[PDB]
Enzyme design. Structure first.
Site, PDB file in Angstrom:
ATOM      1  CB  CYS A   1      -0.935  -0.023   1.216  1.00 27.51           C
ATOM      2  SG  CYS A   1      -2.679   0.389   0.885  1.00 27.51           S
TER       3      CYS A   1
ATOM      4  CG  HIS B   1      -0.902   3.702   4.606  1.00 31.74           C
ATOM      5  ND1 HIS B   1      -0.754   2.561   3.846  1.00 31.74           N
ATOM      6  CD2 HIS B   1      -1.081   3.282   5.880  1.00 31.74           C
ATOM      7  CE1 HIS B   1      -0.839   1.498   4.626  1.00 31.74           C
ATOM      8  NE2 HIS B   1      -1.040   1.908   5.865  1.00 31.74           N
TER       9      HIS B   1
END
Ligand SMILES: NC(=O)c1ccc[n+]([C@@H]2O[C@H](COP(=O)([O-])OP(=O)(O)OC[C@H]3O[C@@H](n4cnc5c(N)ncnc54)[C@H](OP(=O)(O)O)[C@@H]3O)[C@@H](O)[C@H]2O)c1
Lengths: 358, 358
Positions: free
Chosen positions: A155, A249
């Protein structure tokens, strides 16, 4: 047409999200599930301590978890996803490849292997051509379909490279790149993270620095192995941090172009908002049309208020502006739905489905 | 024993000034100023005490005054300011013209060529400009002229703290990045920050970038004005974020030296370990002799783990390692008690008092 899908390390966190996704997919059929001895023989619902906020349908809930061997149902799968623990993924995925199977893996083990594509599917789907040529040339000569592995980037890597691709297509190579990450929890105990910041995620920075070079890199003259951007050609500096945030994130990035002069901020922003990934053009089912949502509000993106809003995009990007050291800085919010291991995995399989590799 | 005024006493910075002064024997809290809707009231009836530590009740009974140089303000040996920038210019000007020694947290006078911008654990020698001016006025007129010294915000102080010893030893730094993970310590509600990241603090990056060049800059030949480092000779790129952390700002930093070749990573660590700020060498009471705490653990500093334990250092610095783009990268944790507005202001007043500028 429906392809048969297997999942290795099915009980684990990434494995759960794989099955959750494939469960809603009209093109795939969950055919085989694999975990350890502690799980083998159990119904999936009994084998897995389910940690997803969404529940799983009953038909998938009752499927009997198998041993991680290319055997029985696994030999019948057109594609085999893997969220296996790295301690065992090495040996297991190799025997799967040896058995002639198509493996799409989130395990780090084979990421750095020279003949293995390391794919963020909204960024470098063309790196799959390496296996595509290998496979199609093998079968055209009448022989058995060889079997292969394609690796899924994390990710964090996926968030970093996502906006970089359109920019590199339009304005040419990037020779300098920084990123400071603010990474969400989704193990990290409340004790570790509440009212706190951990300025260290084990292996994350080396991952980020090395993987981006391969993903944005090329292939050798023989067209069988990858040649990542050399260190003399692109500098990448990562600083990774865990923050008390549940999902999404954030990356504060800086970049410089090799070719002068730098474009304007509006050209950069326009480039990012206009990009359609190759996978969308191929007509892939899980591909976003636009991979990037450019945001003009000076305090955006924020993980909590942009998590759902932009869940259809690969990344949200905000505060795109001229930099004082490099050319541009900006803030990137990743979206797990698209660029997460599970979402990336499915898209790779769709790309393999189109182009007739599986 | 010096008599101290506090302008904008009811505010967050004022509160911190008062609190820290009450624990200080060298000073007497002599005048408190605030808005006209506060004026004429006991301090406990005028202020919403947003601090953890309670004020001695004798301090609580101090009647707040109008922000004018008129009564008790006229007898203060030093007047600290925590006024908001929209009224601070007017009031601080009055005070300087009344002959008073002003030490301000307000942004208004920071860019003025004759006004010292001081992180007292970094550039206390910049006070020499005020000193020489006061020296000049004593020879000329017999009385002190009145002056302002500005305090840099905690974020800038954190960046520049570890840079000072490095620059002394290895020469100027021509490139510097910072991504900040800034604690709560307009305001910032829980609604904004809880389970979230806010990738924007208004004016913060601008201050961080401009103020650094002045703090690490020099003085003109005559010793009458400040000569900040030219943009071209020090490129500073800041990216500031708010995180859900109560106290302790974290800064992820990169730097390159102008003087080639670069020192080793071992030279850098020990340089920071051995640094003793000049304010400590002058004998100032609030200055940390062990100015910097370098931590050797791969996951330190952490705000919650190190904020109490390292509360007597200017900064804790961890993860000092070679960089791939610039020379070195590292994680910096600020300690509000020392380098925050109140702690910095007291130290400036300590230097002013030691140098007989009073
Ligand atoms: N509280 C607990 O008792 C406990 C238990 C498990 C996980 N956790 C935590 O939750 C996280 C989730 O686990 P993870 O997904 O990160 O990693 P993992 O469970 O160790 O491995 C991921 C997948 O690989 C499989 N696997 C492990 N060893 C195998 C073997 N020898 N042969 C074949 N398959 C094997 C697992 O199946 P299996 O389920 O059969 O092992 C799992 O589906 C862990 O990192 C851990 O911190 C806590």
């Amino acid at each position: 047409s429906v392809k048969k899908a297997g999942v290795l390390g099915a009980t684990g966190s990434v494995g759960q999200r794989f099955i959750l996704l494939l469960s809603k997919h009209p093109e795939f059929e969950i055919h085989a599930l694999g975990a350890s001895s502690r799980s083998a023989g159990k119904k999936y619902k009994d084998a897995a301590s389910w940690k997803q906020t969404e529940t799983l349908p009953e038909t998938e809930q009752d499927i009997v978890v198998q041993e991680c061997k290319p055997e029985g149902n696994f030999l019948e799968c057109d594609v085999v996803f893997s969220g296996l623990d790295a301690d065992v993924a090495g040996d297991i995925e190799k025997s799967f490849v040896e058995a002639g199977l198509a493996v799409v893996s989130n395990a780090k083990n084979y990421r750095r292997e020279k003949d293995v594509p390391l794919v963020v599917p909204i960024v470098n789907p063309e790196h799959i051509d390496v296996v595509e040529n290998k496979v199609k040339q093998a079968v055209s000569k009448g022989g058995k379909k060889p079997g292969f592995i394609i690796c899924i980037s994390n990710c964090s890597t996926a968030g970093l490279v996502a906006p970089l691709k359109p920019l590199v297509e339009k304005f040419g190579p990037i020779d300098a790149l920084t990123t400071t990450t603010l990474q969400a929890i989704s193990g990290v105990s409340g004790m570790d993270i509440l009212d706190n910041i951990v300025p260290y995620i084990s292996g994350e920075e080396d991952k980020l620095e090395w993987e981006t070079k391969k993903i944005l890199g090329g292939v050798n003259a023989e067209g069988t192995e990858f040649v990542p951007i050399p260190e003399s050609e692109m500098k990448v500096s990562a600083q990774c941090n865990r923050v008390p945030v549940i999902d999404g994130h954030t990356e504060c990035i800086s970049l410089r172009f090799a070719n002068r002069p730098a474009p304007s901020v509006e050209d950069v922003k326009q480039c990012l908002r206009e990009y359609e990934c190759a996978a969308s053009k191929l007509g892939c089912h899980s591909a976003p049309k636009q991979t990037i949502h450019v945001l003009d509000q000076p305090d955006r993106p924020q993980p909590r208020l942009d998590r759902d809003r932009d869940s259809g995009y690969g990344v949200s990007v905000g505060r795109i502006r001229e930099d004082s050291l490099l050319d541009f800085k900006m803030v990137v919010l990743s979206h797990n739905t698209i660029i997460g291991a599970a979402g990336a995995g499915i898209l790779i399989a769709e790309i393999l489905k189109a182009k007739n590799i599986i």
